[PDB]
Paper text:
Conversely, the installed [name] proteins induce a distinct symmetric dimerization state of N8CRL2FEM1B, named dimerS2. To obtain a higher-resolution structure to unveil the dimerS2 assembly, we collected another cryo-EM dataset for the N8CRL2FEM1B complex bound to the [name] C-degron and solved the dimerS2 structure of N8CRL2FEM1B-[name] at an overall resolution of 3.54 Å. Given that the overall architectures of both dimerS2 structures are exactly the same, we used the higher resolution dimerS2 structure of N8CRL2FEM1B-[name] for structural analysis. The dimerS2 is symmetric and mediated by two [name] molecules, which display weaker density than the other complex subunits, allowing us to build only their main chains. In addition, the two [name] molecules, [name].p1 and [name].p2, interact with each other via symmetric hydrophobic interactions, with Trp35 and Ile37 from one [name] contacting Ile44, Trp87, and Val93 of  the other. The conjugation of [name] disrupts the dimera assembly by introducing potential steric clashes, causing structural rearrangement to form a different dimeric assembly, dimerS2. Intriguingly, sequence alignment with the last 23 amino acids of [name] demonstrated that [name] also contains the upstream aromatic residue Phe (Phe-22). The binding data indicate that the longer fragment of the [name] C-degron (23 aa) binds to [name] > 5-fold more strongly than the 10-aa fragment (KDs: 1.4 vs. 7.6 μM). In contrast, both C-degrons bind to the [name] Ψ pocket mutant (5A) with KDs in the range of 7.8–8.8 μM. This finding suggests that Phe-22 could increase the binding affinity of [name] for [name] by contacting the Ψ pocket.
We recently discovered that [name], a substrate receptor of Cullin 2-RING ligase ([name]), recognizes C-degrons containing a C-terminal proline. By solving several cryo-EM structures of CRL2FEM1B bound to different C-degrons, we elucidate the dimeric assembly of the complex. Furthermore, we reveal distinct dimerization states of unmodified and neddylated CRL2FEM1B to uncover the [name]-mediated activation mechanism of CRL2FEM1B. Our research also indicates that, [name] utilizes a bipartite mechanism to recognize both the C-terminal proline and an upstream aromatic residue within the substrate.
Numbering used by the authors:
A (entry chain E): 246 to 655, 663 to 745
B (entry chain F): 21 to 105
C (entry chain N): 1 to 76
D (entry chain C): 330 to 495
E (entry chain J): 22 to 105
Write the structure that this text describes.
């Protein structure tokens, strides 16, 4: 009709003939097309959705039903891709599933559907529903999952994640982050697992932390990352603060040696989510008294008008042993150091006696003594299973550790990652052979989809390790490759 | 002889002449409540824990309990009160 | 009752089965979190493998415990 | 830009630039996230353009544009069209990089747009506050929402006071 | 003249709380504590609230005396820029 009207009409009628043709061929059968909207969208008929959109755009009310159908289809695909997931790889799998849905459907909209703005708005309105979807009578999960995803992507892990790749990962993560209904809850979590990730030196790089903060400084207001930024500007300055403190040591007035490295982490009060100690009054051990009392002077002169509050439940000390043979150094908090102070001069230390040296109430004293006896550096002198006010303790001299700087519960990231990745390969063996019981013959490329579909609610498997693990099934005499067809596989059972 | 080697101590700094207070009692937030400084100081005491909510405001537990007697909203921004940090 | 059954790399499996729940499908729920299908996780109940119904009272009705499971394939 | 209609024309211009290039990104270049990131950086620099020793005009311009869209205007703009503009407006507001000043201006010209009755419709402010609360967190629109809430109660409050006279 | 209606507006705040210039810890609407002393010489006209970008309110004398020896807002460690 376009060619015919071009051939036999004045140009003023080049748009009324096609308009009146669509009103007698598309707009007159609009219900018949809207009934097929369901089948054309749910089955992802890519060749036909283009014709659907081209026909419906011309007529007046054709588009909104297709917009609603695509929104419903994206909503159901988001729920289907985020219905059931593992409780261990929950953050990364959820974020990557949402990004996969978003990328697939934005490609579909921008290729098949000419990238119409209303279809993109439907995509956004459906992804908003699926991302912060909450079970009834329960709290929404999206903020904590995305905060843990940021934690995992910014932790000093052994995944071989390069700086450029993690920058790309965060820039792609902002796409799902913009769908969070309550980002003030995500910042509550992300500023809390940025306290731990960045007061323990656990951040893999002090530049990716700034990049992630600045990716929320522009995805939200500046006040959003106002406490997130006052932490990052507390640890960058703290490196200068330690140097200034060791130079105040060089004031050259008297001898001001401490015997402790004392690598301080002075932080701002309101910015850090670290609650000031609401209980557990503490007495500084006699070795740290000099460091505390001289850093008080240094922070009195060089920064006048401030009042340090001296958190003690995130401190960390390295204390050697009492000449018990094969000396070790323990990475313990100051809570687990005052109990080792009165423990020095007296081998037999009563619960009452350490109250004059540790001064800490029994609320967390039992907790820290239990944490000590979990690895058993100290033991109950009596036979009492619990800890009472009249208990006694002495050294568990029979205790030994494989490390001089042995860890205490508050290069292991490589070993843990391999063990976690081993369960992925182990499950892949526990996924291939089920097909061998189903059809007994599968092709080389078709087995990838069956394994992935078997692990959709689980980790995303690597294509290389599918081939690598299926070769382990060969020399195990489980399955074998036929010489006639490399794709076809046979097994002994 | 137990000897320490390094101490990775942490410390929050606050302005000395800017004092944070529980907005209801108008006493020091780490200090005792106004009811804990007049009535239950001798009797029980040692129970004026700093209440925290989604409002992210610091209140004495006794003060916020007396505030929640007849009205629900937080007395600094009129937001809903959840007392869940 | 939640379980803490060990695995091939010191992992955990959440059976969420009470002591009166038969191990015919209790191992399936534990293997549902791990990934294994029901009739493939030949779990060892600290000395023996559950067969047929195998009510959990047979395995001392322990709470959580640590049940090392075998990865026996082709058992479906 | 025409100084009389700078806000709306500027927002339409940057929005159509974004739309044209995002169409060019994935219909031609397969829509790589790298190229979309390049588009995001380029348009962030475009919208945040300021003459040296002069403050950026973007927060004030977008606040003025959103106020104009939400204003009770005689142009006869329907609620569906203004809602579509606001949905498309966030594609520009995302790039501001100085949203802490935009809320200062938006709240400053929402105070005028609420007391004087200059609002297009009371349920259209919730179509904008919830499009900034969802896009910038609740603490962003914690004073915008408390300005709107005082309107949904005041009339009722008046109905709790006039009867108090009777 | 006579009036049929007047549309009054009214800010409402709780009396238990008060906005305070935390440097002086006195009332924002009242006079700053440094002009409470030697009030005879001070005309109290210059005692205006100095709102910064931080959305913070302080007495002009208190915030200026702070900025004379400090550089940041005394409620959050942000660089102080006067707004209104
Ligand atoms: Zn109080
Ligand atoms: Zn009290
Ligand atoms: Zn409040
Ligand atoms: Zn003052
Ligand atoms: Zn004054
Ligand atoms: Zn401020």
């Amino acid at each position: 009709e376009e060619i015919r009207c071009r051939k036999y009409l004045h140009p003023s009628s080049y748009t009324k003939v096609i308009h009146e043709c669509q009103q007698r061929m598309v707009a007159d059968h609009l219900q018949f097309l809207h009934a097929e909207c369901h089948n054309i969208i749910r089955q992802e008929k890519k060749n036909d959705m283009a014709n659907m959109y081209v026909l419906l755009r011309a007529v007046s009310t054709g588009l909104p039903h297709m917009i609603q159908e695509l929104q419903n289809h994206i909503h159901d695909e988001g729920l289907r891709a985020t219905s059931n997931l593992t409780q261990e790889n929950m953050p990364t799998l959820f974020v990557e599933s949402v990004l996969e849905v978003h990328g697939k459907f934005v490609q579909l909209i921008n290729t098949v559907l000419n990238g119409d703005q209303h279809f993109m708005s439907a995509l956004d309105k459906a992804l908003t529903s699926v991302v912060n979807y909450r079970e009834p009578k329960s709290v929404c999960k999206a903020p904590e999952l995305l905060a843990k995803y940021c934690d995992n992507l910014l932790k000093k892990s052994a995944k071989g994640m390069t700086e450029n790749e993690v920058e790309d990962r965060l820039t792609s993560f902002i796409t799902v982050f913009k769908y969070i209904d309550d980002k003030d809850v995500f910042q509550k979590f992300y500023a809390r697992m940025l306290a731990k990730r960045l007061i323990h030196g656990l951040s893999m790089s002090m530049d990716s932390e700034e990049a992630m903060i600045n990716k929320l400084k522009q995805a939200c207001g500046y006040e959003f990352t106002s406490k997130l930024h006052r932490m990052y500007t507390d640890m960058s300055v703290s490196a200068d603060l330690n140097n200034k403190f060791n130079n105040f040591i060089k004031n050259q007035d008297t001898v001001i040696d401490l015997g402790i490295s004392f690598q301080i982490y002075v932080l701002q009060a309101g910015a850090w989510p670290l609650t000031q100690a609401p209980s557990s009054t503490f007495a500084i051990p006699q070795e740290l008294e000099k460091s505390v009392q001289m850093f008080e002077l240094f922070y009195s002169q060089h920064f006048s008008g401030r009042k340090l509050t001296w958190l003690h439940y995130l401190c960390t000390g390295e204390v050697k042993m009492n000449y018990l043979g094969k000396p070790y150094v323990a990475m313990v908090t100051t809570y687990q150091m005052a109990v080792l102070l009165a423990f020095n001069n007296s081998e037999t230390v009563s619960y009452k006696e350490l109250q004059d040296s540790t001064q800490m109430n029994e609320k967390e004293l039992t907790k820290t003594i239990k944490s000590l006896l979990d690895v058993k550096m100290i033991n109950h002198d009596s036979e009492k299973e619990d800890i009472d006010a009249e208990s006694s303790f002495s050294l568990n001299m029979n205790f030994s550790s494989k490390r001089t700087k042995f860890k205490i519960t508050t290069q292991e990231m490589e070993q843990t990652r391999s063990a976690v990745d081993e369960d992925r390969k182990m499950y892949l063996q526990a996924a291939i052979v089920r097909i061998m019981k189903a059809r007994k013959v599968l092709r080389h490329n078709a087995l990838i989809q069956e394994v992935i579909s078997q692990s959709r609610a689980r980790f995303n498997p690597s294509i290389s390790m599918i081939k690598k693990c299926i070769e382990v099934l060969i020399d195990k005499q489980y399955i074998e490759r036929s010489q006639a067809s490399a794709d076809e596989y046979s097994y002994v059972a | 002889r137990f000897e320490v080697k390094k101490w990775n101590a942490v410390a929050l700094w606050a302005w000395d002449i800017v004092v944070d207070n529980c907005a209801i009692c108008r006493n020091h937030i780490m200090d005792l409540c106004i009811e804990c400084q007049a009535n239950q100081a001798s009797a029980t005491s040692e129970e004026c824990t700093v209440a925290w909510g989604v409002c992210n405001h610091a209140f004495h537990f006794h003060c916020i309990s007396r505030w929640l007697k007849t009205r629900q909203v937080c007395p600094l921004d009129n937001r809903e009160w959840e007392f869940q940090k | 009752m939640l379980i803490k059954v060990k695995t091939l790399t010191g992992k955990e499996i959440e059976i969420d089965i009470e002591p009166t729940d038969k191990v015919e499908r209790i191992k399936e729920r534990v293997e549902e979190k791990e990934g294994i299908p029901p009739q493939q996780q030949r779990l060892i109940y600290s000395g023996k493998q559950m067969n047929d119904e195998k009510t959990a009272a047979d395995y001392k009705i322990l709470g959580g415990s640590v049940l090392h499971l075998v990865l026996a394939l082709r058992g479906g």
